[PDB]
Amino acid sequence: KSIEVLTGLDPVKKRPGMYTNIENPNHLIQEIIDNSVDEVLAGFASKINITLYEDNSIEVADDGRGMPVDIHPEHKMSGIELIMTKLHSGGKFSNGGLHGVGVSVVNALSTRLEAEIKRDGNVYHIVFEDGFKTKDLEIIDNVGKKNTGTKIRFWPNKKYFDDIKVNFKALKNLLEAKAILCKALTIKYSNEIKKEKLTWHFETGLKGYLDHKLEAETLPAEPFIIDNFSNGDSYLDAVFCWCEDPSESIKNSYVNLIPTPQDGTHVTGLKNGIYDAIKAYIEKNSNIKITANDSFAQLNYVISVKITNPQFAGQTKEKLSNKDVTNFVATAVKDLLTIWLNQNPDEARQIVENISKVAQK
Ligand SMILES: CCc1[nH]c2nc(Sc3cnc4ncc(=O)[nH]c4c3)nc(N3CC[C@@H](N)C3)c2c1Cl
């Protein structure tokens, strides 16, 4: 916030590959979904509904507060126009990417985008084409004051994509993943092309996931769960176990339900917390020169943090960089795993034995 930057959308149109995966429009759909997810994580939304239309357009609707419509005093336009028609960025000191850029990317790369916002008992409607407003924000209907949300329908522009056909299977996989990580959320999908509908809602969250993907034998036999740990405003969900069969390896990480394939400060936090717990257990109870690499080598895990202002790093913005996250995760992991290892000496001893054998080479 020391530096705040607003540009037009030309940079996106000129290098779409820097802002999205141009193979198909799935990453655009992910960007709109992540913006609805932010309402869910803020506590104001419970429902995200996705529709794939026969004309290859995509609609995403939520029951959040409704995107802001107030006129920004400086830019003299509604909040929704501002969010949709400008690239917003800032930071501490001067230094695109697939995350942390914003929904204007979707707007830039679409021939048409419509938004309907229900807020304050009004239904607002606005239209854009190729990243510019083409129909003024207007109130088109009224609704109950508590009937709120945002619905965005968009038509990806074939100029920028290898295929404008949505990859159904990849989308369904992404949505399942998000629902597993957020029990407050119910996701619905309607594919009008295939004539199918799915609904996901995981009351039990990550419980049983690793068992399903692996089994194969794991230590602990029941993968260890960290369930909704919080320090106030940051939250951690995780499941992990060791496995000697390397045929299936699950090592997935997320921030605000966004997959982070380049890992980051949460994954380092996990690795450190695990090692701290293992080192302390060995010392408390007893040899070798075990490292954090050794205790992480056969680890399968899912780690999901929810934090307020995620920062992304690397050219592709797929790595979480928030520095305070590492310690938040490491301490929680060390403490909770320590309790578990103390209550589970037979399995704890085998885990320690297997790690010590990894270290042995
Ligand atoms: C359909 C996708 C969707 N749903 C939304 N709901 C909302 S609801 C909402 C309402 N009031 C807010 N006030 C402040 C704020 O920071 N975020 C807000 C978010 N906002 C969206 N925006 C605004 C900022 C950016 N993250 C996108 C979206 C978006 Cl995009």
Coordinates of C-alpha atoms and ligand atoms in Angstrom, one line a residue:
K1 CA 0.0 0.0 0.0
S2 CA 3.1 2.3 0.0
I3 CA 2.8 2.1 -3.8
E4 CA -0.6 1.8 -5.4
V5 CA -0.9 1.3 -9.2
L6 CA -3.9 1.4 -11.6
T7 CA -3.5 0.8 -15.3
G8 CA -5.8 -0.1 -18.3
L9 CA -5.9 -3.7 -19.5
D10 CA -3.7 -3.4 -22.6
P11 CA -0.9 -5.3 -20.8
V12 CA -3.2 -8.3 -20.4
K13 CA -4.4 -8.3 -24.0
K14 CA -0.9 -8.0 -25.3
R15 CA 0.5 -10.9 -23.2
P16 CA -2.5 -13.1 -22.1
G17 CA 0.0 -15.9 -21.3
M18 CA 1.4 -13.8 -18.5
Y19 CA -2.0 -13.5 -16.8
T20 CA -3.8 -16.8 -17.6
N21 CA -3.2 -20.2 -18.9
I22 CA -4.2 -19.8 -22.5
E23 CA -4.8 -23.5 -23.2
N24 CA -8.5 -23.0 -22.4
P25 CA -10.6 -20.6 -20.3
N26 CA -10.4 -22.8 -17.1
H27 CA -8.0 -20.4 -15.4
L28 CA -10.3 -17.5 -16.0
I29 CA -13.1 -19.4 -14.3
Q30 CA -10.7 -20.1 -11.4
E31 CA -10.1 -16.4 -11.1
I32 CA -13.8 -15.6 -10.8
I33 CA -14.3 -18.5 -8.4
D34 CA -11.4 -17.2 -6.2
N35 CA -13.1 -13.8 -5.9
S36 CA -16.3 -15.5 -4.7
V37 CA -14.2 -17.7 -2.3
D38 CA -12.8 -14.6 -0.7
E39 CA -16.4 -13.7 0.4
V40 CA -16.8 -17.3 1.8
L41 CA -13.6 -16.9 3.8
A42 CA -14.7 -13.5 5.0
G43 CA -17.7 -15.3 6.4
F44 CA -20.3 -13.7 4.2
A45 CA -21.0 -16.4 1.5
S46 CA -21.8 -20.1 1.6
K47 CA -22.7 -20.9 -2.0
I48 CA -20.9 -20.8 -5.2
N49 CA -22.8 -21.9 -8.4
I50 CA -21.1 -22.5 -11.8
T51 CA -22.9 -22.8 -15.1
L52 CA -21.4 -23.8 -18.3
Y53 CA -23.6 -22.7 -21.2
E54 CA -23.9 -24.2 -24.7
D55 CA -22.5 -20.9 -26.2
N56 CA -19.2 -21.6 -24.3
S57 CA -19.8 -18.9 -21.8
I58 CA -19.4 -19.4 -18.1
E59 CA -21.5 -18.0 -15.2
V60 CA -20.3 -18.0 -11.5
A61 CA -22.8 -16.9 -8.8
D62 CA -22.4 -16.4 -5.1
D63 CA -24.5 -15.4 -2.0
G64 CA -21.9 -12.9 -0.7
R65 CA -22.4 -9.3 0.1
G66 CA -22.5 -8.2 -3.5
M67 CA -19.6 -6.4 -5.2
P68 CA -19.5 -2.7 -4.3
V69 CA -21.5 -0.2 -6.4
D70 CA -20.6 3.0 -4.7
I71 CA -19.0 5.8 -6.8
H72 CA -15.3 6.1 -6.0
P73 CA -14.7 9.8 -5.4
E74 CA -11.4 9.9 -7.3
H75 CA -12.0 7.7 -10.3
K76 CA -15.7 8.8 -10.5
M77 CA -17.0 5.3 -11.3
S78 CA -18.8 2.6 -9.4
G79 CA -16.6 0.1 -7.5
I80 CA -17.6 -2.7 -9.9
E81 CA -16.6 -0.7 -13.0
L82 CA -13.3 0.2 -11.3
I83 CA -12.6 -3.4 -10.2
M84 CA -13.5 -4.8 -13.7
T85 CA -11.9 -2.2 -16.1
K86 CA -8.5 -1.5 -14.4
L87 CA -5.4 -3.6 -13.3
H88 CA -4.9 -2.9 -9.7
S89 CA -1.6 -3.6 -8.0
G90 CA 0.5 -2.3 -5.1
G91 CA 3.4 -3.2 -2.8
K92 CA 6.0 -2.0 -0.4
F93 CA 8.8 -1.1 -2.9
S94 CA 9.0 -1.3 -6.7
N95 CA 10.3 -4.7 -7.9
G96 CA 1.7 -10.3 -14.3
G97 CA 1.2 -13.7 -12.8
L98 CA -1.6 -16.2 -12.4
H99 CA -2.9 -15.0 -9.0
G100 CA -3.2 -11.8 -7.1
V101 CA -3.9 -9.7 -10.2
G102 CA -7.7 -9.7 -10.1
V103 CA -10.9 -10.2 -12.1
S104 CA -10.2 -7.5 -14.6
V105 CA -8.0 -10.1 -16.3
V106 CA -11.2 -12.1 -17.0
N107 CA -12.8 -8.9 -18.3
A108 CA -9.8 -8.0 -20.6
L109 CA -9.9 -11.5 -22.2
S110 CA -13.6 -11.7 -22.8
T111 CA -15.7 -10.4 -25.7
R112 CA -18.5 -9.8 -23.2
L113 CA -18.9 -9.9 -19.5
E114 CA -22.1 -9.2 -17.6
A115 CA -22.4 -8.7 -13.8
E116 CA -25.6 -8.7 -11.7
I117 CA -25.2 -7.6 -8.1
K118 CA -27.8 -7.9 -5.4
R119 CA -27.1 -5.5 -2.7
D120 CA -29.2 -3.2 -0.4
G121 CA -32.4 -4.5 -1.9
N122 CA -31.4 -3.5 -5.4
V123 CA -30.5 -5.7 -8.4
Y124 CA -27.8 -3.9 -10.3
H125 CA -26.7 -4.8 -13.8
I126 CA -23.7 -3.8 -15.9
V127 CA -22.2 -5.0 -19.2
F128 CA -18.6 -4.8 -20.6
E129 CA -17.2 -5.8 -23.9
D130 CA -13.4 -6.4 -24.4
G131 CA -12.7 -4.9 -21.0
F132 CA -14.7 -1.6 -21.4
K133 CA -18.1 -0.8 -20.0
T134 CA -20.8 -0.8 -22.7
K135 CA -23.9 -0.6 -20.6
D136 CA -24.1 1.7 -17.6
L137 CA -24.7 0.3 -14.1
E138 CA -28.5 0.3 -13.5
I139 CA -31.0 -0.9 -11.0
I140 CA -33.2 -3.4 -13.0
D141 CA -35.2 -5.0 -10.1
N142 CA -35.6 -5.0 -6.3
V143 CA -35.1 -7.8 -3.9
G144 CA -35.2 -8.4 -0.1
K145 CA -32.4 -6.6 1.8
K146 CA -30.9 -9.9 2.9
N147 CA -31.0 -11.4 -0.6
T148 CA -27.4 -10.6 -1.7
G149 CA -24.7 -11.8 -4.0
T150 CA -22.8 -11.4 -7.2
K151 CA -23.3 -13.2 -10.5
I152 CA -20.8 -12.8 -13.4
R153 CA -21.3 -14.4 -16.8
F154 CA -18.4 -14.1 -19.4
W155 CA -17.7 -15.1 -23.0
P156 CA -13.9 -15.7 -23.4
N157 CA -12.4 -14.1 -26.5
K158 CA -11.1 -16.8 -28.9
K159 CA -8.3 -14.3 -30.0
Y160 CA -6.4 -15.1 -26.9
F161 CA -7.0 -18.9 -26.3
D162 CA -5.9 -22.2 -28.0
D163 CA -9.4 -23.5 -27.3
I164 CA -12.4 -21.7 -25.9
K165 CA -14.0 -24.9 -24.9
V166 CA -14.0 -25.4 -21.1
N167 CA -12.1 -28.5 -19.9
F168 CA -15.0 -30.1 -17.9
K169 CA -12.9 -32.7 -16.0
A170 CA -10.3 -30.2 -14.9
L171 CA -12.9 -27.8 -13.6
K172 CA -14.8 -30.6 -11.7
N173 CA -11.4 -31.6 -10.1
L174 CA -10.7 -28.0 -9.1
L175 CA -14.2 -27.5 -7.6
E176 CA -14.0 -30.8 -5.6
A177 CA -10.7 -29.7 -4.2
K178 CA -12.1 -26.3 -3.0
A179 CA -15.1 -27.9 -1.4
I180 CA -12.9 -30.5 0.5
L181 CA -11.0 -27.5 2.0
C182 CA -14.0 -25.4 3.2
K183 CA -16.9 -27.0 5.0
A184 CA -18.7 -23.7 5.1
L185 CA -19.1 -24.0 1.3
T186 CA -21.4 -25.7 -1.0
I187 CA -20.5 -25.7 -4.7
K188 CA -22.9 -26.5 -7.6
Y189 CA -22.0 -27.1 -11.2
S190 CA -24.4 -27.3 -14.1
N191 CA -23.0 -28.3 -17.5
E192 CA -25.6 -27.5 -20.1
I193 CA -23.4 -29.0 -22.8
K194 CA -23.3 -32.4 -21.3
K195 CA -26.6 -32.1 -19.3
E196 CA -25.0 -32.8 -15.9
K197 CA -25.2 -31.3 -12.4
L198 CA -23.0 -31.9 -9.4
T199 CA -23.1 -30.6 -5.9
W200 CA -20.1 -30.8 -3.5
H201 CA -20.2 -30.2 0.2
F202 CA -17.7 -31.8 2.6
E203 CA -19.1 -31.7 6.1
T204 CA -16.0 -33.7 7.2
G205 CA -13.5 -31.7 5.1
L206 CA -10.2 -33.5 4.6
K207 CA -11.1 -36.5 6.8
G208 CA -10.5 -39.7 4.7
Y209 CA -9.0 -37.9 1.7
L210 CA -5.5 -39.2 2.2
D211 CA -6.8 -42.7 3.0
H212 CA -8.7 -42.6 -0.3
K213 CA -5.8 -41.4 -2.4
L214 CA -3.1 -43.6 -0.8
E215 CA -3.9 -46.7 1.1
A216 CA -1.2 -48.3 0.8
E217 CA -0.2 -48.3 4.5
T218 CA 0.6 -45.0 6.2
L219 CA 2.0 -43.8 9.4
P220 CA 0.0 -42.9 11.4
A221 CA -2.5 -45.5 10.1
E222 CA -5.1 -42.7 10.5
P223 CA -3.5 -39.7 8.8
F224 CA -2.9 -36.9 11.2
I225 CA -5.4 -34.0 10.9
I226 CA -5.0 -30.4 12.0
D227 CA -8.6 -29.1 12.1
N228 CA -9.3 -25.4 11.8
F229 CA -6.3 -24.1 13.9
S230 CA -6.4 -20.3 14.3
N231 CA -4.4 -17.6 15.9
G232 CA -7.3 -15.1 15.5
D233 CA -7.4 -14.1 11.9
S234 CA -5.3 -16.8 10.2
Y235 CA -6.4 -20.4 9.8
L236 CA -4.7 -23.7 9.1
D237 CA -6.2 -27.0 7.9
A238 CA -3.8 -29.9 7.2
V239 CA -3.6 -33.7 6.9
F240 CA -0.4 -35.6 6.7
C241 CA 1.3 -39.0 7.0
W242 CA 4.3 -40.9 6.0
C243 CA 4.3 -43.6 3.3
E244 CA 7.0 -45.9 2.1
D245 CA 5.2 -46.7 -1.2
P246 CA 6.3 -43.8 -3.4
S247 CA 3.9 -44.8 -6.2
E248 CA 1.3 -42.3 -5.1
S249 CA 2.6 -39.0 -3.7
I250 CA 0.3 -36.3 -2.5
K251 CA 2.0 -33.0 -1.6
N252 CA -0.6 -30.3 -2.2
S253 CA -0.7 -26.8 -0.7
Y254 CA -3.2 -23.9 -0.9
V255 CA -3.8 -20.3 0.3
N256 CA -7.5 -19.2 0.4
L257 CA -8.4 -22.4 -1.5
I258 CA -6.0 -21.4 -4.3
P259 CA -3.6 -24.1 -5.2
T260 CA 0.0 -23.0 -4.9
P261 CA 2.0 -25.4 -7.1
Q262 CA 5.2 -23.4 -6.3
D263 CA 4.6 -23.9 -2.6
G264 CA 5.9 -21.2 -0.3
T265 CA 5.8 -20.0 3.3
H266 CA 3.0 -22.4 4.4
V267 CA 4.9 -25.5 3.0
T268 CA 8.2 -24.3 4.6
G269 CA 6.2 -23.9 7.9
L270 CA 4.9 -27.4 7.6
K271 CA 8.4 -28.9 6.9
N272 CA 9.9 -26.9 9.8
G273 CA 7.1 -27.8 12.3
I274 CA 7.3 -31.5 11.5
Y275 CA 11.1 -31.5 12.0
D276 CA 10.8 -29.5 15.2
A277 CA 8.3 -32.1 16.6
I278 CA 10.4 -35.1 15.4
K279 CA 13.7 -33.6 16.8
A280 CA 12.1 -32.8 20.2
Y281 CA 10.5 -36.3 20.5
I282 CA 13.8 -38.0 19.7
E283 CA 15.7 -35.9 22.3
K284 CA 12.9 -36.1 24.9
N285 CA 12.9 -40.0 24.7
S286 CA 16.6 -41.1 23.9
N287 CA 21.5 -40.9 17.7
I288 CA 21.9 -39.8 14.0
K289 CA 22.1 -36.4 12.3
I290 CA 18.5 -36.2 11.1
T291 CA 17.6 -33.1 9.0
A292 CA 14.3 -31.4 8.1
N293 CA 14.7 -32.9 4.6
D294 CA 14.8 -36.4 6.1
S295 CA 11.6 -35.9 8.2
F296 CA 9.9 -34.5 5.0
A297 CA 11.1 -37.0 2.5
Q298 CA 8.2 -39.6 2.8
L299 CA 5.6 -37.1 3.9
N300 CA 2.3 -36.9 2.0
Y301 CA 0.2 -33.9 2.9
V302 CA -2.4 -31.4 2.1
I303 CA -1.9 -28.0 3.7
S304 CA -4.5 -25.2 3.4
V305 CA -4.0 -21.7 5.0
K306 CA -6.6 -18.9 5.0
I307 CA -5.1 -15.5 5.5
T308 CA -6.4 -12.0 4.9
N309 CA -4.1 -10.4 2.3
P310 CA -2.2 -13.2 0.5
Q311 CA 1.0 -12.3 -1.3
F312 CA 2.2 -14.3 -4.2
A313 CA 5.8 -14.5 -5.5
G314 CA 7.7 -15.9 -8.6
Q315 CA 7.1 -14.9 -12.2
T316 CA 3.9 -16.9 -12.3
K317 CA 2.7 -15.9 -8.8
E318 CA 2.1 -19.5 -7.7
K319 CA 4.2 -19.4 -4.5
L320 CA 2.8 -18.0 -1.2
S321 CA 5.3 -15.4 0.2
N322 CA 3.6 -13.9 3.3
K323 CA 6.6 -14.1 5.7
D324 CA 4.6 -14.4 9.0
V325 CA 2.9 -17.6 7.7
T326 CA 6.0 -19.8 8.2
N327 CA 6.0 -19.3 11.9
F328 CA 2.2 -19.5 12.3
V329 CA 2.3 -23.0 10.6
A330 CA 5.5 -24.3 12.2
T331 CA 4.4 -23.6 15.8
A332 CA 0.9 -25.0 15.3
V333 CA 2.3 -28.1 13.6
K334 CA 5.1 -28.7 16.2
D335 CA 2.6 -28.3 19.1
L336 CA -0.3 -30.4 17.7
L337 CA 1.9 -33.2 16.4
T338 CA 3.9 -33.3 19.7
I339 CA 0.6 -34.0 21.6
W340 CA -0.2 -36.7 19.1
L341 CA 3.2 -38.3 19.2
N342 CA 3.0 -38.3 23.0
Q343 CA -0.3 -40.1 23.0
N344 CA 0.8 -42.6 20.3
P345 CA 4.1 -44.1 21.3
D346 CA 4.0 -47.2 19.2
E347 CA 3.3 -45.4 15.9
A348 CA 5.6 -42.6 17.0
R349 CA 8.5 -45.0 17.4
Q350 CA 8.0 -46.4 13.9
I351 CA 7.8 -42.9 12.3
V352 CA 11.0 -42.0 14.1
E353 CA 12.6 -45.2 12.9
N354 CA 11.6 -44.7 9.3
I355 CA 12.9 -41.1 9.3
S356 CA 16.2 -42.2 10.9
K357 CA 16.6 -44.7 8.0
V358 CA 16.0 -42.0 5.4
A359 CA 18.8 -40.0 7.1
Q360 CA 21.1 -43.0 7.2
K361 CA 21.9 -42.3 3.5
Ligands
LIG1 C1 -18.7 -13.6 -8.7 C2 -17.3 -13.4 -8.3 C3 -17.3 -12.3 -7.2 N1 -18.1 -12.2 -6.1 C4 -17.7 -11.1 -5.3 N2 -18.2 -10.6 -4.2 C5 -17.8 -9.5 -3.6 S1 -18.6 -9.0 -2.2 C6 -17.8 -7.7 -1.4 C7 -18.5 -6.7 -0.9 N3 -18.0 -5.7 -0.3 C8 -16.6 -5.6 -0.1 N4 -16.0 -4.5 0.5 C9 -14.7 -4.5 0.7 C10 -13.9 -5.5 0.1 O1 -12.6 -5.5 0.3 N5 -14.4 -6.6 -0.5 C11 -15.7 -6.7 -0.7 C12 -16.4 -7.7 -1.3 N6 -16.8 -8.8 -4.1 C13 -16.1 -9.1 -5.2 N7 -15.0 -8.3 -5.6 C14 -14.8 -7.0 -4.9 C15 -13.3 -7.0 -4.8 C16 -12.7 -8.2 -5.6 N8 -12.1 -9.2 -4.7 C17 -13.9 -8.8 -6.4 C18 -16.6 -10.4 -5.9 C19 -16.4 -11.2 -7.1 CL1 -15.2 -10.8 -8.4

